[PDB]
Design a protein around this ligand. Structure first.
Ligand SMILES: O=P(O)(O)OC[C@H]1CN(Cc2cncc(CO)c2)C[C@@H]1O
Ligand SMILES: O=P(O)(O)OC[C@H]1CN(Cc2cncc(CO)c2)C[C@@H]1O
Lengths: 124, 122
């Protein structure tokens, strides 16, 4: 299983420690392809994105990059899991919340402390 | 001339005034189109029926980025407006998706937005 991980960087790194947690778990389930010059980045991740079997994304921290990766990932027909925290106070965008279909694209609300648990349940 | 605008909403509304300015100008030049699943499907419709997607991308937003991802995949023509005065560095997914031709990113100053839009639209 080849896994692509999306999570905010230039939109804010508020959740970096959580991203690391989320990635540490994914490496128990597969290789993680992720992690003028912005053109290299764009070009490289678009290739990794093409190769993934699951696209896992943390969508609390608003970010253009994460949004665009999801848009290209829907186009490529990839299987997509999004993770959102209602505790944050924000309201997930409707473009994300309503691209969900309940299987190929899923969106799960969670509390930050049980992310490993949830991850175990999805990749089983 | 069918026009789709995107700007931040559930990821921030600091630029609401500036969005109104862009929409007003957009209307000179053409038709402007602007449950959560209704919204996603209805918007994905206009996005498809569009001939050019204009996004203001100064403020980070999942939905503007998504819409942009889908428009690159609908090979639609795209123009992005970015404000260095915000102090943000724009996402590399946006600056680097650009090809100078069918996908453009222009850095402008808040005052000149009307002028930029006039140049873009002959
Ligand atoms: O928050 P961002 O920055 O807008 O997008 C964040 C997403 C886009 N990423 C690709 C990327 C990787 N290294 C630097 C950049 C510069 O942005 C972008 C991975 C991340 O999931
Ligand atoms: O900031 P957002 O919400 O993440 O995305 C912002 C873009 C998504 N919009 C579609 C939309 C329309 N009515 C409510 C919502 C609630 O999101 C969203 C147009 C806007 O260009």
């Amino acid at each position: 299983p080849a896994l692509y991980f999306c999570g905010s960087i230039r939109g804010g790194r508020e959740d970096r420690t959580l991203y690391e947690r989320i990635v540490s778990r994914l490496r128990r389930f597969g290789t993680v392809l992720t992690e003028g010059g912005d053109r290299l980045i764009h070009e490289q991740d678009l290739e990794w994105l093409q190769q993934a079997d699951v696209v896992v994304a943390e969508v609390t921290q608003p970010s253009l990059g994460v949004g665009y990766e999801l848009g290209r990932a829907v186009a490529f027909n990839k299987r997509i899991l999004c993770l959102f925290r209602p505790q944050s106070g924000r309201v997930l965008s409707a473009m994300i919340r309503g691209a969900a279909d309940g299987s190929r694209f899923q969106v799960w609300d969670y509390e930050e402390g049980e992310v490993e648990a949830l991850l175990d349940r999805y990749f089983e």
